């Protein structure tokens, strides 16, 4: 799993020896890639968020906890008792599919909303059946009343779980299947109607329910636990300014970060032990991101003693020790005395982190994306496999065995294939991170391997006619 | 109280004696007003909310445990502690009052938005002194982003919150009192957001908290029982459908309502007893009126045993012992094969049952004004201090004792006033009864003392240049 | 004609002797009648509109000419020559029908959206007949998509215009009669899109065709003038400030308003001319009411010189011989120092002028009705026809005659009866005039027969049970 | 100019030898580009809009019209008459500028909203110099109340419009200049306000205004013609269907369509001459795009004759020689017996045909860039200039001359620069076209020159990971 290529580089020891480092950063898994060139020197902020960037969390374990308590949570409001013998697993999702509430359908498509893969339960939908329900083989990904975009890493569980029930209806001799969703005599379930259900019990169970009370309550299983994060943090507040911008509320906040923090050391080993705070120039909870980067909520300030919000709007200076609760992306730029590019921000989530930051603010930005730690592990592994599939194309574009090849590729990753691509053919999710993240890895973790003043380069582009 | 009074009409044994009924019906306290003529023969479906018409709370006791518990869900969420000194004063709370979120002010309103009564916490304005903040002495009472018109029972615990905490922050030195709330050094609560905190505190206490809760452990204390109920509505039955359809959730109802019919005898005394679902051909919970009479929701069918939703949308027919969820007010016309002229709705809610089964469905309407049963009291016993002021009127009229006699009449309802005047100028609540309830009363009990085809009579209108 | 009554009454010299007005005031012909209270002496603003205030358009000649000029509009854009036969009749249409474009309807409602009359064409559909498509004989008026309300006297030609279209297209052999439509072949033209071709002939002959070009090009065919309404203008100046505050645009106004002040005299006979600009204190034209109660339009000053807009909001005082465009009531309230209340604005747009600026602004209003002149004279003739009706009431109320004595009496206003009431029944616009209208008339000139500090006066009002 | 180019190769006879095409096709002059790969046998309908594409208007002709035209426009409303000595300069505008309507500025921007010129009028603000306006050197581009961005070909006098008055007003001493507009005394307006007024007159040119008829009376000077447009048209109805869909009305399509196929032959020269129409499977008016890919319009017909619409909307079939109007792009697939990707769709809106044929449906896309013609020789010409500012980049990224090569080579495409680029850095625009055009050229005539099954190639794109 990809937590476990990133738990084995958090416990190894961080020389910083430059020459070390120069070749260290050079290993494809401690890359930090380049979509547009950024130099390090001009950043004075340094923003994160807190999801699966600082608090990694564990994997399978973490999902499968989330969709356990969310099925708990269907069978609750009154899903029948068989849902309970569904497990998780980690095999079949890829993050990035789009479920169709029309028909049921979880669809891999590229940037244009051309259908890569389809698959109506576990049942792979080859090209031409699926052009029955899709006639262009397309849809309009940007109509939100019929299609969900699960491109986060908390939506894995529930892509496995929507494929389960449309799965565990079709095959209950009590339901009959339609185009648009289950009858049961008197009854019709449709699909919309049974994504909005699981919409819900997740949102429940993130919120309401007992995931971040059984996360906390163990936390060396769900969570990892790097050694050189405050040494990469405690650099950063070197060279510039260190923020924390996070969705989350204070009292879960301070518990994971309490955790992530918790060595006999700080920044380096030897070092007496320095509280989590003490890292971070800015505490925001509550963020609200996309909302955060447009107008964002009142200004409040926690009562770090209570974890309740002390009552008003703040109105006061940045002070040592204080921690604010929602505001918006200009709260942090007036505080710090920042303007966008001056600032990378650094996140999990391709819409609300990156693609918002980006376009609203012009943020710098990196894109934390915790699979490709084992993504490239495949990529590199079965290149030859790839390299075979790009000969076989330019063979026929200078003129169906593609397709058997792309099939071994995709298969290599899951069931769904990889995260940026279906053969030769780049994934929505792949066109957003070159789009709006400036610079990406599987880790943060791995700007470490990188001196303070680097210049991170992208080619310049030209169009066909410059070429 | 009025729920005393209504407790005493309650105990009263029901002689069917027919001279005994048209002589009954004669007494204020047990008639039905007639703002709009109805023929009762015409009444084919008779319907039903359930809050405060069949479930009468009693006064002041249910007020002062919702006021209670959302005084301890804001101290929960950091208010100070002071606030659970707080006692619930039902002399303060009139209904239908407005609060202005930008000045921290109750108005009294007529129906056009003029200033009848203004007050600041506990602190009553006069005239001049409201013309610095009401230069008009006018609101667009429409404005709901600023205004806030409080018009339910359910409102009147939040309605003497809002004033006690108006009167407590004025009055704690730790802050400085502003035009528009509350600074205290770096942060300022606006009254705007402490009314959306009482907002989400009355909210939470009322759907997630120990309401409902505290109230079916304890029916004999919160709710009023009238073995008149189970009588009147076997009446209606005889002569018509009779449905439910109430915003509660199925389990709540059924426990109330359980205790509503909880007699050792049906209808009558000696008749076996009957399960209160028997009195009604058609029973839906989780209305969301006003929505119920627009687009609704979608027809969700209950599981009696377990209480929870069946999965599905509803597609069959009406049946015997069926509950229906959502819907929406086309559900029962359908299914009852009723049209809305045909149809009696009986309500609290001026608003929500009221004025939008009236204005979008043309339903027939019956307004329970649990307030009347005292407020009739007072105006029968102090009559003589109305008609003075109707002597001073058409005196001067045809020509500041006014003002005196003015307060000294309003001062018999409590501080602020009759729910239906300030002296002689009528209150929007007023305005709304006369315009969108047909009928009203304190009490639909008192539809008992009327004969199955009663015609309920009111003038006709004429504009003034057709008089 | 009302506009005949109009002219008559205009024509009459105005002898100011006090005796000979008090009595003359007595006249129901020119009285002003009461809605709500009003001491003329608080008011110290007087604001106009133009339409048929000032401006009173000759009936039916005016209609017609709109009638004509929309007709070819229509055959203009491509619908039949046959059109051209149609000739407006002023007989048929009543103010403030609705429209159905779904059905294609004409109906006449009460203020509780129950019918009253329908009609198809010219064809009337009788009360069972209209169950079919109106199941509760009801519609919700405030569906806009669906109803359109001719509330207005531009209206009238548009009212009878629809008519013909439904009776011309529902006898055209070339065409089928179909529920919503009709059809010809594959061609399907459906009430709804028939509705909008008129409703955009109605706007572009209003606003780009010659219909004001043909008015102010013989004005004496198509405007009354009073040599009254300087008179009385010049005796409100006196008390109080008076503004104009229109829609037209100032090069229409300054044409008309020259027009109405043309006479030989000032104010009184005698006395020397005086430029119509004069007699106003504060002169806005391209108002946007009802908008213009709102936010408005930014405030324009208007070239006098050459009829267009000066460059530039306009963000100086009031100042002598200044001409306004766009701004919002604020600006007449701010500039001529005055709140709502010190206002009587007098309007012929029930919805945008009065409505409006009551809501809105809690000004006090005067609302002219032109026909008022003609329907009192049918109210008081015909009045024996009315009372027997009353009797026929009271009488079955205390037991399909009515239905005949309801046809005749109605039949002497036009085929689609009073504008007031059908029978016994109150219409809509009935019952916004009483709402809204603190008072009415079917001239504002009528107030020259009242001194200056009258008070108007209504009864107080009292609910069922305070009575 | 660029029209001049494409005149000069309009004039040009089509030697169809294959062996003369293939090498023809090679200057890329006469090329297409391509941004993804499109194989041109599986398209089934060619479709195009008439804008630019077919009628290609003579520049700097048919630019200085309407600017004249549009002057004269704001003249007659009341700008000042110095505006009458304003002219066209064809030097200044580049197309896909963004007018900034708070601080009165044209921007030219990259595809992240940085700014890469800035001009007030015609001065052009250095970067430091932004900075007090734009902090971050950034714009929220979608922010469209404040921003407007000027992408069409239309668009190009009203971009030197506006600069022109920002400029005379900035000059003009009756006028203060103020940061968000000019002060006049008691009047101000504001850059947004003058906004207005241009779009507004720009509109009212091109729909109400004299445009058309000033185009169709001289149509030699104002519409370049080509005798290979009806050789293309007939080769591509050899191979497939060919369809129009304008935004034009019928009227004037007719007029230009003739005289853009006015030759006394047909395809080839020695042919007997053909109508227009017969040119096109589906002829389409009034199209409303962008409207027209998502809901569109209701379908009418044209009445040919009459260049009315008739009445009704059109329920039939595909028939030869109706013409259509309005519709949606729904209505081309049915009738067409079309999917999206069998459609090549040829435009010259990068908004309202490229981005949204491609985002709503799916359609394959053709962008006509005119200016190309020009663009492509001074890249050509002047390319050891980007030559040299590729290799200054590379040798200072491997380490402000770099601002004056960039400076000289912008130059040479005029005041505000290459379409594609500043220096180095390429615009929204040039991103825009990459990522929505699938092929593009600067005439669609380019077409000719390539092989009836020609496989148009794109190189596959690799993430950073992936290379």
Redesign the interface.
């Known amino acids: 799993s990809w937590s476990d290529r990133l738990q084995n580089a958090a416990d190894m020891p961080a020389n910083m020896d430059k020459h070390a480092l120069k070749k260290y950063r050079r290993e494809?898994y401690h890359?930090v890639?380049?979509?547009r060139?950024l130099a390090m020197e001009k950043i004075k902020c340094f923003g994160f968020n807190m999801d699966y960037t600082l608090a990694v969390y564990k994997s399978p374990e973490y999902e499968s906890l989330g969709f356990e308590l969310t099925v708990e949570r269907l069978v609750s409001?009154?899903?029948?008792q068989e849902l309970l013998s569904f497990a998780y697993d980690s095999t079949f999702p890829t993050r990035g599919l789009v479920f169709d509430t029309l028909y049921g359908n979880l669809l891999k498509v590229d940037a244009?909303?051309?259908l890569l893969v389809c698959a109506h339960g576990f049942n792979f939908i080859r090209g031409p059946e699926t052009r029955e329900q899709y006639?262009?083989?397309?849809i309009?990904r940007?109509d939100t009343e019929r299609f969900y975009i699960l491109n986060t890493l908390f939506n894995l569980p529930e892509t496995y779980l929507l494929a389960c029930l449309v799965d565990f209806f079709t095959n209950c001799p009590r339901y009959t299947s339609c185009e648009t969703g289950?009858k049961?005599?008197?009854?019709?379930?449709?699909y919309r109607?049974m994504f909005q259900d699981v919409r819900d019990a997740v949102d429940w169970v993130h919120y309401k329910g007992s995931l971040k009370e059984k996360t906390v309550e163990n936390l060396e299983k769900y969570v990892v636990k790097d050694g050189k994060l405050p040494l990469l943090l405690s650099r950063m507040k070197e060279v510039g300014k260190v923020f924390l911008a996070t969705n989350s509320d204070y009292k879960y906040t301070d518990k994971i970060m309490t955790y992530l923090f918790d060595f006999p050391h700080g920044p380096k080993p030897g070092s007496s032990h320095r509280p989590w705070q003490s890292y971070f120039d800015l505490i925001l909870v509550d963020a609200r991101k996309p909302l955060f980067f447009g107008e964002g909520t009142?200004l409040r300030?926690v009562?770090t003693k209570?974890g309740?919000?002390?009552?008003?709007?703040?109105?006061?200076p940045l002070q040592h020790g204080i921690v604010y609760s929602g505001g918006s992306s200009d709260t942090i730029c007036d505080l710090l005395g920042a303007?966008?590019?001056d600032i990378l921000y650094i996140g999990d989530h391709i819409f609300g982190d990156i693609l918002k930051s980006?376009?609203?603010?012009?943020w710098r930005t990196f894109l934390v994306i915790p699979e490709?730690a084992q993504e490239?592990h495949v990529?590199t592994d079965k290149s030859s496999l790839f390299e075979e599939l790009?000969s076989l194309?330019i063979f026929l574009?200078e003129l169906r065995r593609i397709k058997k090849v792309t099939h071994d590729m995709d298969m290599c990753y899951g069931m769904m294939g990889s995260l940026?691509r279906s053969g030769?053919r780049?994934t929505l999710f792949?066109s957003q991170?070159?789009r709006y993240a400036d610079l990406?890895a599987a880790s943060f973790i791995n700007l470490l391997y990188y001196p303070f003043s680097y210049?991170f380069?992208?080619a310049?582009?030209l169009?066909?006619?410059?070429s």
């Open positions: 494809a890359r890639f380049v979509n060139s409001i009154g899903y029948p244009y909303g051309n006639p262009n083989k397309f309009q940007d289950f049961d005599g008197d009854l019709f379930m449709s109607s009142v300030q009562d209570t309740k919000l002390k009552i008003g709007t703040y109105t006061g303007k966008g590019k980006k376009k609203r603010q012009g490709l490239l990529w790009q194309d574009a940026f030769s780049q792949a991170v070159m990406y210049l380069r992208a310049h582009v169009m066909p006619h410059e």
